[PDB]
Amino acid sequence: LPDFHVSEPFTLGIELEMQVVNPPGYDLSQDSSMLIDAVKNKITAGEVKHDITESMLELATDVCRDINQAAGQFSAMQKVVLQAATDHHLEICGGGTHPFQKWNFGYLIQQATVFGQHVHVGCASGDDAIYLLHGLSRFVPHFIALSAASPYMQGTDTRFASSRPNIFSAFPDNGPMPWVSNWQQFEALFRCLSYTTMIDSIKDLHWDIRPSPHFGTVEVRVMDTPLTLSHAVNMAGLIQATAHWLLTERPFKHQEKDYLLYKFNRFQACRYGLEGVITDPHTGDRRPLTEDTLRLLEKIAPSAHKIGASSAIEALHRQVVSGLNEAQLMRDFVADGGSLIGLVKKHCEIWA
Amino acid sequence: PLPDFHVSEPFTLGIELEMQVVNPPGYDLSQDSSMLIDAVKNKITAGEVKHITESMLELATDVCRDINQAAGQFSAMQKVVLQAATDHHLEICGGGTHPFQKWQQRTLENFGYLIQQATVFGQHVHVGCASGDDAIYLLHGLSRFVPHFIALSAASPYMQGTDTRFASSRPNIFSAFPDNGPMPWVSNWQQFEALFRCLSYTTMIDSIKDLHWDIRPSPHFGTVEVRVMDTPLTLSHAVNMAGLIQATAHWLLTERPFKHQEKDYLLYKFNRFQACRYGLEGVITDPHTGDRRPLTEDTLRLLEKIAPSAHKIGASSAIEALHRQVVSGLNEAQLMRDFVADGGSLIGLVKKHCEIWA
């Protein structure tokens, strides 16, 4: 593995996997490679690629300093993209799963395509990356609940706020990174994992949060892709302010037992969103995520000012206080008599 | 708190087989394994026959001293069950999954669509031990061969009518639950209680029985329970898998051949996946040395180390039959695939599996 790249203070990078739908039926497209081959010169900052499926358009920012910069690169990418979409009679929308799309790892891979948002935070060293990773792992339940946007799967209400994460549960590498206390221990772990033929690079390990020594960042990849660009930017600010608070204040001394209930709390967030309950593994104390998330928001507020994300922190606070659950909001649209086709159309208009 | 760990006679055996009750002439999972059970009330001389899941019949031996006593208790329950079946026009067969069946507690609330799949069927083996520390040592020893147990028992390539491409797909059914796979690491009984105390702080678990681990300790029965295997097509195989586990348990606790450390589990999920997907053709990788070898080869090394222990406890037959299987280059999953490749239907396949069990 290469030396851990020394990145600039808390740099930021965002990747969004958007859905490409084909009107008027509004199911996922399969001919969206021509979208990239339509913006292959119409994007100055950031990057746009596509999956092997052709139903996903990935937008990525370059390395930014704050959410205002990310927001600008996304805004500029959005105009071109929307133009190309219209030019090809296609539409773009966010969300963790397409509501009705129906589909060697055999059948595990034969499930509908899903859409996630990844956020990269710069670190100065490997030991800092490891500290940042463990610190962020504590709020993964919170990051999932705040971004949950995938209640529907193949036409049925799964009851989950975010069902997308269930699609990877059978894979060996799913979930939290195995524990390591520092960068040296991480290199040994990666060395051991590399023994299998399945693992050749870190890119192959789909942990919820993973470090990158080549880019000098820690990557959070547990979130559903948001319905709007602004919410995606706010989640990124949230993660950047938490990173700043963790690394500058070092509020915790990380212990393996901090991860004991990691999967149980992760499940509660996927299944119930902010109404899920988080349990402390050391004391057994339980708290709804709405309450606990408000406490995270108040704790990282000063750090949010410092790196320019206080506006994201304030908006997330307003949303937790009022409820605003996209999962439910989708269910209400449908409960009010709207159709899944209509819901996808609504989401296309919303993203624009 | 958890019960004190019951002092069992070491190496005794308790076996459970969840059998499939199918309905001719369509051969789908039946919804009457109840009237069949009520038909065998009392008839069972030793052991027990119970359901949960109207398509499932569970055959459980009592606590046995050796595999022969076990082969005995099953053979007798089998005759009884086979006759009750005949009188109700139902049939019985093994296998980890029903090849074409499609789906129709406080678990629904929590998991929703995740548990609304097809019924899966496993063989469970309980090995008695003297204490909690011994149970922990025994569990870690057995965790090293979980890939071997799965591969040797693989018999669930089909799921809901479709070929999954796995040898044993049943072990994935619980991949979405927070407590599936290997038990979190603890080094002795004292730490295990601390582990269980932690886990029970959550809503879905108040007892050892709510845990979906591959291998689970039972302070109540005074046993270490291996629960990763698919229910085999025959009773002889079920009995032979129990003898392997018993022989390995004997080798582990008497020779104490490994010095257990958390790093031993590092590649547990990758090796577990290789077994599920390719059966004995799977490759096993050591996390320490990085050595890679197919499960066929590794299973033969296991059979060698446990031959002496098997002789003393009366399970050499199990070991020899397993050895022939390993070098036979044939596996239930491929035999099911060949059947279908040759023109057979999944329905025909189930009918054939009922004739095999009988």
Coordinates of all heavy atoms in Angstrom, one line a residue, chain B residues 224-279:
Chain B
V224 N -22.4 -26.9 23.1 CA -21.9 -25.9 22.1 C -22.7 -26.4 20.9 O -22.6 -27.6 20.5 CB -20.4 -26.0 21.8 CG1 -20.1 -25.3 20.5 CG2 -19.6 -25.4 22.9
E225 N -23.5 -25.6 20.3 CA -24.4 -26.0 19.1 C -24.0 -25.5 17.7 O -24.0 -24.3 17.4 CB -25.8 -25.6 19.4 CG -26.8 -26.1 18.4 CD -28.2 -25.5 18.6 OE1 -28.3 -24.6 19.4 OE2 -29.1 -25.9 17.8
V226 N -23.6 -26.4 16.9 CA -23.3 -26.1 15.5 C -24.6 -26.0 14.7 O -25.3 -27.0 14.6 CB -22.3 -27.1 14.9 CG1 -21.9 -26.6 13.4 CG2 -21.0 -27.2 15.7
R227 N -24.9 -24.9 14.1 CA -26.1 -24.7 13.3 C -25.9 -24.2 11.9 O -26.6 -23.3 11.4 CB -27.0 -23.7 14.1 CG -27.2 -23.9 15.5 CD -27.9 -22.7 16.2 NE -29.2 -22.4 15.5 CZ -30.3 -23.0 15.8 NH1 -30.4 -24.0 16.7 NH2 -31.4 -22.7 15.2
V228 N -24.8 -24.6 11.2 CA -24.6 -24.0 9.9 C -25.0 -24.9 8.7 O -25.1 -24.5 7.6 CB -23.1 -23.6 9.6 CG1 -22.8 -22.5 10.5 CG2 -22.2 -24.8 9.9
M229 N -25.2 -26.2 9.0 CA -25.5 -27.2 7.9 C -26.9 -27.3 7.4 O -27.9 -27.1 8.1 CB -25.1 -28.5 8.4 CG -23.6 -28.8 8.3 SD -23.1 -29.9 9.8 CE -23.0 -28.4 11.0
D230 N -27.0 -27.6 6.1 CA -28.2 -27.8 5.4 C -28.7 -29.2 5.9 O -27.8 -30.0 6.2 CB -28.0 -27.9 3.9 CG -27.7 -26.5 3.3 OD1 -27.9 -25.5 3.9 OD2 -27.3 -26.6 2.1
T231 N -30.0 -29.5 5.9 CA -30.5 -30.8 6.3 C -30.1 -31.7 5.1 O -30.5 -31.4 3.9 CB -32.0 -30.8 6.4 OG1 -32.4 -30.0 7.5 CG2 -32.5 -32.3 6.6
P232 N -29.3 -32.8 5.3 CA -28.9 -33.7 4.2 C -30.1 -34.5 3.6 O -31.1 -34.6 4.2 CB -27.9 -34.7 5.0 CG -27.6 -33.9 6.2 CD -28.8 -33.2 6.6
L233 N -29.8 -35.2 2.5 CA -30.8 -36.0 1.8 C -31.1 -37.3 2.5 O -32.2 -37.9 2.3 CB -30.4 -36.3 0.4 CG -30.2 -35.1 -0.6 CD1 -30.1 -35.6 -2.0 CD2 -31.4 -34.2 -0.4
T234 N -30.2 -37.7 3.3 CA -30.3 -39.0 4.1 C -30.0 -38.9 5.6 O -29.4 -37.9 6.0 CB -29.4 -40.0 3.5 OG1 -28.0 -39.6 3.8 CG2 -29.5 -40.2 2.0
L235 N -30.4 -39.9 6.3 CA -30.1 -39.9 7.7 C -28.7 -40.4 8.0 O -28.0 -39.9 8.9 CB -31.1 -40.9 8.5 CG -32.5 -40.4 8.5 CD1 -33.5 -41.4 9.1 CD2 -32.6 -39.1 9.4
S236 N -28.1 -41.2 7.1 CA -26.8 -41.6 7.3 C -25.9 -40.4 7.2 O -25.0 -40.3 8.0 CB -26.3 -42.7 6.2 OG -26.5 -42.2 4.9
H237 N -26.1 -39.5 6.2 CA -25.3 -38.4 6.2 C -25.4 -37.5 7.4 O -24.5 -36.9 7.9 CB -25.5 -37.6 4.9 CG -24.4 -36.6 4.6 ND1 -23.1 -37.0 4.4 CD2 -24.4 -35.2 4.6 CE1 -22.3 -35.9 4.3 NE2 -23.1 -34.8 4.4
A238 N -26.7 -37.4 7.8 CA -26.9 -36.6 9.0 C -26.1 -37.1 10.2 O -25.5 -36.4 10.9 CB -28.4 -36.5 9.3
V239 N -26.1 -38.4 10.3 CA -25.4 -39.1 11.4 C -23.9 -39.0 11.2 O -23.1 -38.8 12.2 CB -25.8 -40.6 11.4 CG1 -24.8 -41.4 12.4 CG2 -27.2 -40.8 11.9
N240 N -23.4 -39.1 10.0 CA -22.0 -38.9 9.7 C -21.5 -37.5 10.0 O -20.4 -37.3 10.4 CB -21.7 -39.4 8.3 CG -21.8 -40.9 8.2 OD1 -21.7 -41.6 9.2 ND2 -21.9 -41.4 7.0
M241 N -22.3 -36.5 9.7 CA -21.9 -35.1 10.0 C -21.8 -34.9 11.5 O -20.9 -34.2 12.0 CB -22.8 -34.1 9.4 CG -22.8 -34.0 7.9 SD -20.9 -33.7 7.2 CE -20.7 -31.9 7.9
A242 N -22.7 -35.6 12.3 CA -22.6 -35.5 13.7 C -21.4 -36.1 14.3 O -20.8 -35.6 15.2 CB -23.9 -36.1 14.3
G243 N -21.0 -37.2 13.7 CA -19.8 -37.9 14.2 C -18.5 -37.1 13.9 O -17.6 -37.1 14.7
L244 N -18.5 -36.4 12.7 CA -17.4 -35.6 12.4 C -17.3 -34.5 13.5 O -16.2 -34.3 14.1 CB -17.6 -34.9 11.1 CG -16.6 -33.8 10.7 CD1 -15.2 -34.4 10.4 CD2 -17.1 -33.0 9.5
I245 N -18.4 -33.8 13.8 CA -18.4 -32.8 14.8 C -18.0 -33.3 16.1 O -17.2 -32.7 16.9 CB -19.7 -32.0 14.8 CG1 -19.9 -31.2 13.5 CG2 -19.8 -31.1 16.0 CD1 -21.3 -30.7 13.2
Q246 N -18.5 -34.5 16.4 CA -18.2 -35.1 17.7 C -16.7 -35.4 17.8 O -16.0 -35.1 18.8 CB -19.0 -36.4 18.0 CG -19.0 -36.8 19.4 CD -19.3 -38.3 19.6 OE1 -19.3 -39.0 18.6 NE2 -19.5 -38.7 20.8
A247 N -16.2 -36.0 16.7 CA -14.8 -36.4 16.7 C -13.9 -35.1 16.8 O -12.9 -35.1 17.5 CB -14.4 -37.2 15.5
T248 N -14.3 -34.1 16.1 CA -13.5 -32.9 16.2 C -13.6 -32.2 17.6 O -12.6 -31.7 18.1 CB -14.0 -31.9 15.1 OG1 -13.9 -32.6 13.8 CG2 -13.1 -30.7 15.1
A249 N -14.8 -32.3 18.2 CA -14.9 -31.7 19.5 C -14.0 -32.5 20.5 O -13.3 -31.9 21.3 CB -16.3 -31.9 20.0
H250 N -13.9 -33.8 20.3 CA -13.0 -34.6 21.2 C -11.6 -34.3 21.1 O -10.8 -34.1 22.0 CB -13.3 -36.1 20.9 CG -12.5 -37.0 21.8 ND1 -11.2 -37.4 21.5 CD2 -12.8 -37.6 23.0 CE1 -10.7 -38.1 22.5 NE2 -11.7 -38.3 23.4
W251 N -11.1 -34.1 19.8 CA -9.8 -33.7 19.5 C -9.4 -32.4 20.0 O -8.4 -32.2 20.7 CB -9.6 -33.7 17.9 CG -8.3 -33.3 17.4 CD1 -7.1 -33.8 17.8 CD2 -8.1 -32.2 16.6 NE1 -6.1 -33.0 17.2 CE2 -6.7 -32.1 16.4 CE3 -8.9 -31.3 15.9 CZ2 -6.1 -31.1 15.6 CZ3 -8.3 -30.3 15.1 CH2 -6.9 -30.2 14.9
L252 N -10.3 -31.4 19.8 CA -10.2 -30.0 20.3 C -10.0 -29.9 21.8 O -9.1 -29.4 22.3 CB -11.3 -29.2 19.9 CG -11.3 -28.7 18.4 CD1 -12.6 -28.0 18.0 CD2 -10.1 -27.8 18.2
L253 N -11.0 -30.5 22.6 CA -10.9 -30.4 24.0 C -9.9 -31.3 24.7 O -9.4 -31.0 25.8 CB -12.3 -30.6 24.6 CG -13.3 -29.5 24.5 CD1 -14.7 -29.9 25.1 CD2 -12.9 -28.2 25.1
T254 N -9.5 -32.4 24.1 CA -8.5 -33.3 24.8 C -7.1 -32.9 24.4 O -6.2 -32.9 25.2 CB -8.8 -34.8 24.4 OG1 -8.6 -35.0 23.1 CG2 -10.2 -35.2 24.8
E255 N -6.9 -32.6 23.1 CA -5.5 -32.2 22.7 C -5.2 -30.7 22.7 O -4.1 -30.3 22.7 CB -5.3 -32.7 21.3 CG -5.4 -34.3 21.1 CD -4.3 -35.0 21.8 OE1 -3.1 -34.7 21.5 OE2 -4.6 -35.9 22.7
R256 N -6.3 -29.9 22.8 CA -6.1 -28.4 22.9 C -5.0 -28.1 21.9 O -3.9 -27.5 22.3 CB -5.7 -28.0 24.3 CG -6.6 -28.4 25.4 CD -7.8 -27.5 25.4 NE -8.8 -28.0 26.4 CZ -9.6 -27.2 27.1 NH1 -9.6 -25.9 26.9 NH2 -10.5 -27.8 28.0
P257 N -5.2 -28.3 20.6 CA -4.2 -28.1 19.5 C -4.1 -26.6 19.0 O -3.1 -26.3 18.3 CB -4.8 -29.0 18.4 CG -6.2 -29.0 18.6 CD -6.3 -29.1 20.1
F258 N -5.0 -25.8 19.3 CA -4.9 -24.4 18.9 C -4.9 -23.5 20.1 O -5.4 -23.8 21.1 CB -6.1 -23.9 18.0 CG -6.4 -24.8 16.9 CD1 -7.6 -25.5 16.9 CD2 -5.6 -24.9 15.8 CE1 -7.9 -26.3 15.8 CE2 -5.8 -25.8 14.8 CZ -7.0 -26.5 14.8
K259 N -4.2 -22.3 19.8 CA -4.1 -21.3 20.8 C -5.1 -20.2 20.1 O -4.7 -19.6 19.2 CB -2.7 -20.7 20.9 CG -2.5 -19.7 22.0 CD -1.3 -18.8 21.7 CE -1.2 -17.6 22.7 NZ -0.1 -16.7 22.3
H260 N -6.3 -20.1 20.6 CA -7.2 -19.2 20.0 C -6.9 -17.7 20.2 O -6.6 -17.3 21.4 CB -8.6 -19.4 20.6 CG -9.1 -20.8 20.5 ND1 -9.2 -21.5 19.3 CD2 -9.6 -21.7 21.4 CE1 -9.7 -22.7 19.5 NE2 -9.9 -22.8 20.7
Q261 N -7.1 -16.9 19.2 CA -6.9 -15.4 19.2 C -7.9 -14.8 18.2 O -8.3 -15.5 17.3 CB -5.5 -15.1 18.8 CG -5.1 -15.7 17.5 CD -3.7 -15.5 17.2 OE1 -3.1 -14.4 17.1 NE2 -3.0 -16.7 17.0
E262 N -8.3 -13.6 18.5 CA -9.3 -13.0 17.6 C -8.9 -13.0 16.1 O -9.7 -13.1 15.2 CB -9.7 -11.5 18.1 CG -10.7 -10.8 17.1 CD -11.5 -9.8 17.8 OE1 -11.1 -9.3 18.9 OE2 -12.6 -9.5 17.3
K263 N -7.6 -12.8 15.9 CA -7.2 -12.8 14.5 C -7.5 -14.0 13.7 O -7.5 -14.1 12.5 CB -5.6 -12.5 14.4 CG -5.1 -12.3 13.0 CD -3.6 -12.1 13.0 CE -3.1 -12.0 11.5 NZ -1.6 -11.7 11.5
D264 N -7.8 -15.1 14.4 CA -8.1 -16.4 13.7 C -9.4 -16.3 12.9 O -9.5 -16.9 11.8 CB -8.3 -17.5 14.8 CG -7.0 -17.9 15.5 OD1 -5.9 -17.6 14.9 OD2 -7.1 -18.5 16.6
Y265 N -10.3 -15.4 13.3 CA -11.5 -15.2 12.6 C -11.5 -14.2 11.4 O -12.5 -14.0 10.7 CB -12.6 -14.7 13.5 CG -13.2 -15.8 14.4 CD1 -12.5 -16.2 15.6 CD2 -14.4 -16.4 14.2 CE1 -13.1 -17.1 16.5 CE2 -15.0 -17.3 15.0 CZ -14.3 -17.7 16.2 OH -14.9 -18.6 17.0
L266 N -10.3 -13.5 11.2 CA -10.1 -12.5 10.2 C -10.7 -12.8 8.8 O -11.4 -12.0 8.3 CB -8.7 -12.2 10.1 CG -8.3 -10.8 9.6 CD1 -9.2 -9.7 10.4 CD2 -6.8 -10.5 9.9
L267 N -10.5 -14.0 8.3 CA -11.1 -14.4 7.0 C -12.3 -15.3 7.1 O -12.7 -15.9 6.2 CB -10.0 -15.0 6.1 CG -8.8 -14.1 5.9 CD1 -7.8 -14.9 5.0 CD2 -9.2 -12.8 5.2
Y268 N -12.9 -15.3 8.3 CA -14.0 -16.2 8.5 C -15.1 -16.1 7.5 O -15.6 -17.1 6.9 CB -14.6 -16.0 9.9 CG -15.7 -17.0 10.3 CD1 -15.4 -18.2 11.0 CD2 -17.0 -16.6 10.1 CE1 -16.5 -19.0 11.4 CE2 -18.1 -17.5 10.5 CZ -17.8 -18.7 11.2 OH -18.8 -19.4 11.6
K269 N -15.5 -14.8 7.2 CA -16.6 -14.6 6.2 C -16.2 -14.9 4.8 O -17.1 -15.4 4.0 CB -17.1 -13.2 6.3 CG -17.7 -12.9 7.7 CD -18.3 -11.5 7.8 CE -18.8 -11.3 9.2 NZ -19.5 -10.1 9.4
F270 N -15.0 -14.7 4.4 CA -14.5 -15.0 3.0 C -14.5 -16.5 2.8 O -15.0 -17.0 1.8 CB -13.1 -14.4 2.8 CG -13.2 -12.9 2.9 CD1 -13.0 -12.2 4.1 CD2 -13.5 -12.1 1.8 CE1 -13.1 -10.8 4.2 CE2 -13.6 -10.7 1.9 CZ -13.4 -10.1 3.1
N271 N -13.9 -17.2 3.8 CA -13.9 -18.7 3.7 C -15.3 -19.3 3.8 O -15.6 -20.3 3.2 CB -13.0 -19.2 4.9 CG -11.5 -18.9 4.7 OD1 -11.0 -18.8 3.6 ND2 -10.9 -18.6 5.9
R272 N -16.2 -18.7 4.6 CA -17.6 -19.1 4.7 C -18.2 -19.0 3.4 O -19.0 -19.9 2.9 CB -18.3 -18.3 5.8 CG -19.7 -18.8 6.2 CD -20.3 -17.7 7.2 NE -21.6 -18.1 7.8 CZ -22.7 -18.0 7.2 NH1 -22.9 -17.6 5.9 NH2 -23.8 -18.4 7.9
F273 N -18.0 -17.8 2.7 CA -18.6 -17.6 1.4 C -18.1 -18.6 0.4 O -18.8 -19.1 -0.5 CB -18.2 -16.2 0.9 CG -18.6 -15.9 -0.5 CD1 -19.8 -15.4 -0.8 CD2 -17.8 -16.3 -1.5 CE1 -20.2 -15.2 -2.2 CE2 -18.1 -16.1 -2.9 CZ -19.3 -15.6 -3.2
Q274 N -16.8 -19.0 0.4 CA -16.3 -20.0 -0.5 C -17.0 -21.3 -0.4 O -17.2 -22.0 -1.4 CB -14.8 -20.1 -0.3 CG -13.9 -19.0 -0.8 CD -13.8 -18.9 -2.3 OE1 -13.4 -19.9 -3.0 NE2 -14.1 -17.8 -2.9
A275 N -17.3 -21.7 0.8 CA -18.0 -22.9 1.0 C -19.4 -22.9 0.5 O -19.8 -23.8 -0.2 CB -18.0 -23.3 2.5
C276 N -20.1 -21.9 0.8 CA -21.5 -21.7 0.4 C -21.6 -21.7 -1.1 O -22.5 -22.4 -1.7 CB -22.0 -20.4 0.9 SG -22.3 -20.4 2.7
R277 N -20.7 -21.0 -1.8 CA -20.7 -20.8 -3.2 C -20.2 -22.0 -4.0 O -20.8 -22.4 -5.0 CB -20.0 -19.6 -3.6 CG -19.8 -19.4 -5.1 CD -21.1 -19.3 -5.9 NE -20.9 -19.3 -7.3 CZ -20.6 -20.3 -8.1 NH1 -20.6 -21.5 -7.5 NH2 -20.4 -20.2 -9.4
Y278 N -19.1 -22.6 -3.6 CA -18.5 -23.7 -4.4 C -18.4 -25.0 -3.7 O -17.8 -25.9 -4.3 CB -17.1 -23.3 -4.8 CG -16.9 -22.0 -5.5 CD1 -16.5 -20.8 -4.8 CD2 -17.1 -21.9 -6.9 CE1 -16.4 -19.6 -5.5 CE2 -17.0 -20.7 -7.6 CZ -16.6 -19.5 -6.9 OH -16.4 -18.3 -7.6
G279 N -19.0 -25.2 -2.5 CA -18.9 -26.5 -1.9 C -17.5 -26.9 -1.6 O -16.7 -26.0 -1.2

